[PDB]
Structures are given as structure tokens and as C-alpha cells.
Ligand binder design. Structure first.
Ligand SMILES: [Cu+2]
Ligand SMILES: [Cu+2]
Lengths: 110, 110
């Protein structure tokens, strides 16, 4: 049994959405298990993908512990290695405040 | 411009090859740039993917600084983040000595 590579936002990919609830509706339709990966597809240089530690920072789009940026190449494929809540955002400009952020709950595979 | 996700061994995937030179011929037909990723597809639980630090360890299949194992889920997708030589092996049994190892040279994207 192969693990799944989920395509964030399906055909829409990773961008600033028209409705702020876009990625949380997308995540609620899937089940994510340890071993799966998340693929973020976007036009190079326009966005990025950063994982945040805590819900508070994710909620506030506060990137003080975030990494200066650097890599904006796509696709970015992140492995889901640990159980529990994971938070990813785009740190460009106001994109996170405009809804380009995704929180998912990872469960075991067995 | 999207980065490439290369499929290690193309349709063959990641397994112990019939000829020991299999993965080095596969790697010599491609160009790998920072930002691309390598996807290793194999039957769960049968192999794994581990990156080694030095050529000497890779050459000898010496896994003394290697990580106990743990995750054998597939696919494993590794991002190529740094320039220069990268070495990956399967640490199960005698697979590395039997040719299940891959060394690639990563160049810049610009
Ligand atoms: Cu963005
Ligand atoms: Cu193996």
C-alpha cells in the first residue's frame, strides 16, 4: 500500500483564494495519514510554503520565528511525518491574512 | 517555471536492480537542479531511502551514522536543496551492496 500525495487545493493549487475558507474546506474533505505528502503547486517566485509551530502564530500570521524566506520554487512537497495538527502558510505580503494558510490533522497509518 | 519531480528509475522505481549500474545510468541521463525533487516508489515495508553524508560511506554501504530506519512508507519524495553531490541508499539487508544506491550531482537553477 502506497501512501497518498495530496495536491493542496486540487486543480486550484496554492494561491490566494477568492474565499477565505477555501483551504479549510479542502482539508476537511480528506484524511491525512503519517507517510502521506502534501504537494503545493504555484507559479515560481509568487508564493512560498512555510510550516508554523503553533496555532497562535498561524492564526495571527505572525512570522517572527519564520525563515527569512529564500526558496520560492514549485512544486514544494512536504512529508507528513508526525501525528497531530500541522500548519502551513505563505509568508509573502498579506497572503496569509487573505486566507493562504492550511491546517491539517495527521492520523496514523495502521 | 515549475521545478521537476524526477521519478527514480522511471517506471522501474526503487528496488534492487538486475544490473548494478542501473541507477547510475539512470542518473547520467538527467540534469538535476536545486528545487527539483526525487520521488522513490517501492512496495511499502520492502525498502527505505536514506541520504548519506560522504562518498566513502556510500561507497562502502557503511551505515554507522545512519538512522535506525523506522519509516518504510512509499513514496518518499526528497527535495534537492543544495548544490553538489548527493548520495541515497536503501539500508535494508544487502540491498545497497547489490546496487540499490544512487548518487546525483545537483546544479543551480538559474
Ligand atoms: Cu502567497
Ligand atoms: Cu531495499
Amino acid at each position: 500500500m502506497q501512501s497518498t500525495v495530496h495536491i493542496v487545493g486540487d486543480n486550484t493549487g496554492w494561491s490566494v483564494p477568492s474565499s477565505p475558507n477555501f483551504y479549510s474546506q479542502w482539508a476537511a474533505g480528506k484524511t491525512f495519514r503519517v507517510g502521506d505528502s502534501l504537494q503545493f503547486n504555484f507559479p515560481a517566485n509568487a508564493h512560498n510554503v512555510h510550516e508554523m509551530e503553533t496555532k497562535q502564530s498561524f492564526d495571527a500570521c505572525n512570522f517572527v520565528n519564520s525563515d527569512n524566506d529564500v526558496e520560492r520554487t514549485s512544486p514544494v512537497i512536504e512529508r507528513l511525518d508526525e501525528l497531530g495538527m500541522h500548519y502551513f502558510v505563505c509568508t509573502v505580503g498579506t497572503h496569509c491574512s487573505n486566507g493562504q494558510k492550511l491546517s491539517i490533522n495527521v492520523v496514523a497509518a495502521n
